[PDB]
From Swiss-Prot, chain A:
Protein name per Swiss-Prot or TrEMBL: Adenylate kinase isoenzyme 5
Cellular localisation: Cytoplasm
GO BP annotation list: ADP biosynthetic process; ATP metabolic process; dADP biosynthetic process; pyrimidine ribonucleotide biosynthetic process
GO annotations of cellular component type: centriolar satellite; cytoplasm; cytosol
Membrane-spanning parts: none
Whole sequence portion shown: 369 to 562 of 562
Assembly and binders: Monomer. Interacts with YWHAZ.
UniProt keyword list: ATP-binding, Cytoplasm, Kinase, Nucleotide-binding, Transferase
Swiss-Prot record, chain B:
Gene field: AK5
GO BP annotation list: ADP biosynthetic process; ATP metabolic process; dADP biosynthetic process; pyrimidine ribonucleotide biosynthetic process
Family designation: Belongs to the adenylate kinase family.
UniProt GO cellular component terms: centriolar satellite; cytoplasm; cytosol
Organism: Homo sapiens
Chain segments carrying region LID 2: 132-142
Lineage: Eukaryota, Metazoa, Chordata, Craniata, Vertebrata
Expressing tissues: Brain specific.
Residues of the full protein shown: 368 to 562 of 562
Record key words, sorted: ATP-binding, Cytoplasm, Kinase, Nucleotide-binding, Transferase
Protein name: Adenylate kinase isoenzyme 5
Length: 195, 196
């Protein structure tokens, strides 16, 4: 699996809240047949399992503490190993959270052939999030809250983006257009590495 | 108003390793004393379930397995305490704080605990209890290695904090190796000794 997992299609896709990443991942899954993974879903599944390891993770999460990179990676490797054979490739959504976690992924699993960055302005992200918002607070309040959320995304993503731009595996996609036009751009990037 | 109210209310921190019996003791303390039991885990769970816009920032963080900033947890804590003030006899803050600066911040922003309870239990006893509660489908060696990591994480979180509150307030170490009913007895003794 070491050699199999390594010599196989791995795409990271990143983007802030309101970038359209969720919907585009579904479209990509539908088109390409990729295995769509994310740490949040992997953590949720593990927590539902009653394993001793899920109890460790829960001890940590209940303190608001960081879940070590190595546990997250163990969960990815297992999901990836479970999907090999019947896979057209791996779409890892929202990963990595930090450069060192990405580096460790590279060493222990495989280097992604493509890191897609869903590039989008704060204003657009904010409008999409406002539209979906269920709060009945004043819009001013809701917008300040959304702003804080974008600001924290921007601070986590910057060094990651920089790392992959420095390694030249990053494709920036203009996530501002129609869903139709964004998807085309995504497929153009994917087809350009994997053909 | 709330500021001086929060500063003068009963604040007890209770710290204990997994398998120490802390959870079940807290439920009994709440029932007996009419305290409000607060924990980070439960506060986080509740914020997330609220579906508030503010909650989505925490959801982003936790989906990466990233650390939730202390300010966010403190905010949620303060809000829980303000909401319970006037229909509670005191706060039992369970497994908090996780580091010293976070405790110092609590002290400045909310109030100083009058009592820190530490539920002392050996690693061997915590390990054995946690095996008794295990649903592991893995061999006992693998299973016990993961339990050892759970204790390691507890010791990391607890040692600096316990050492700090020893210097600052009343800290009572309870022998949690006993029966749960004896542990309850000792807890009640500790609490009664402080609140008069
Ligand atoms: N909360 C979630 N976050 C990220 N991915 C999810 C989530 N729930 C399901 N998925 C997966 O991501 C895509 C969208 O989710 P769904 O269509 O609800 O299954 C699917 O391809 C799922 O495999
Ligand atoms: Cl959202
Ligand atoms: Cl010991």
């Amino acid at each position: 699996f070491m050699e199999d997992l390594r010599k196989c299609k791995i795409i990271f896709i990143i983007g802030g809240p309101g970038s359209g990443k969720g919907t585009q991942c579904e479209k990509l899954v539908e088109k390409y047949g990729f295995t769509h993974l994310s740490t949040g879903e992997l953590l949720r599944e593990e927590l539902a399992s009653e394993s001793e390891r899920s109890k460790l993770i829960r001890d940590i999460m209940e303190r608001g503490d960081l879940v070590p990179s190595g546990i997250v990676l163990e969960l990815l490797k297992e999901a990836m190993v479970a999907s090999l054979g019947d896979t057209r490739g791996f779409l890892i959504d929202g990963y990595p959270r930090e450069v060192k976690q990405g580096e460790e992924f590279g060493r222990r699993i495989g280097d992604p052939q493509l890191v897609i960055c869903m590039d989008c302005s704060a204003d657009t992200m904010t409008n999409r999030l406002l539209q979906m918002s269920r709060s009945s607070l004043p819009v001013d309040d809701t917008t300040k809250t959304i702003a804080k959320r974008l600001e924290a995304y921007y601070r986590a993503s910057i060094p990651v983006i920089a790392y992959y731009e420095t390694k030249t595996q990053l494709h920036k996609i203009n996530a501002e257009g129609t869903p139709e036009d964004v998807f085309l751009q995504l497929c153009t990037a994917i087809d350009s590495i994997f053909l």
